[PDB]
Write a protein that binds this ligand. Sequence first.
Ligand SMILES: Nc1ncnc2c1ncn2[C@@H]1O[C@H](COP(=O)(O)O)[C@@H](OP(=O)(O)O)[C@H]1O
Ligand code: NA
Length: 256
Amino acid sequence: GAMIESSTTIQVISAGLPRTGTKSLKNALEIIYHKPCYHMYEIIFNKQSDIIKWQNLIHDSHMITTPLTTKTIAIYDKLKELLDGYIATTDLPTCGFYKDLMNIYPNAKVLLTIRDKYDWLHSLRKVVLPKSNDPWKLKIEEGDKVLGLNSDFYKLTEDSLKFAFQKDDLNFDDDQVLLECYDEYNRLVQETVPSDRLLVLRLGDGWEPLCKFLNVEIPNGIDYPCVNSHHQMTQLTEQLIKYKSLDAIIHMFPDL
Ligand SMILES: Nc1ncnc2c1ncn2[C@@H]1O[C@H](COP(=O)(O)O)[C@@H](OP(=O)(O)O)[C@H]1O
Ligand code: NA
């Protein structure tokens, strides 16, 4: 196909929850668009100063009146600031803001990444939200400290998940609650976003449906990304603990 000059603004809003292939999708969108895609790893690795900004935004988010009202505009302005220079959103904390992002970026299309609910829960428990009594939680925390992440990082994860699930509080250690929230969330995205504007992706779908949806050619000779497995995250955590810096081990984790 011909090369065309793409606008550096949000073109793709991915509503998919953490552990549904968001990092692979981030990488895929960056391959297509040649501009950055937002993801929690963007915060971890490039923008830790954004943590307090997202926390503030979530704190004020209850005041969003679903469109435009005054306080809504103030919130939309901060969202647009956070996402300046990016061409897509994936993962927490952005995913729960999908309806709002649709208003802010009326010409953006929406994706929903999904998978088997139990595989999702298993993955979530290994990486994002281990149970309180799980010894592995201590290892995650130790590795995270090496990255400069503290309690405010976990607070952002918690609060952005509460926001996505529209719960005032949430028993994070309760598998049944999380499973119900996952199903309800995915159902609601599909009820809310007009089908013309939505593509539902299952893990393994690869380039074809995504590229068709976006009117772009399939990147030549480049496989669809498969990254961020829980096994890989376990190794990352262990290596951070072992070496006590990211820069010492980063050569071992390409595409991160
Ligand atoms: N192209 C692909 N095909 C199949 N699974 C993929 C994939 N890309 C990512 N995944 C899976 O998606 C999960 C990561 O999602 P996220 O990036 O949103 O945190 C991991 O699940 P597992 O932990 O079960 O391995 C990972 O293996
Ligand atoms: Na399986």
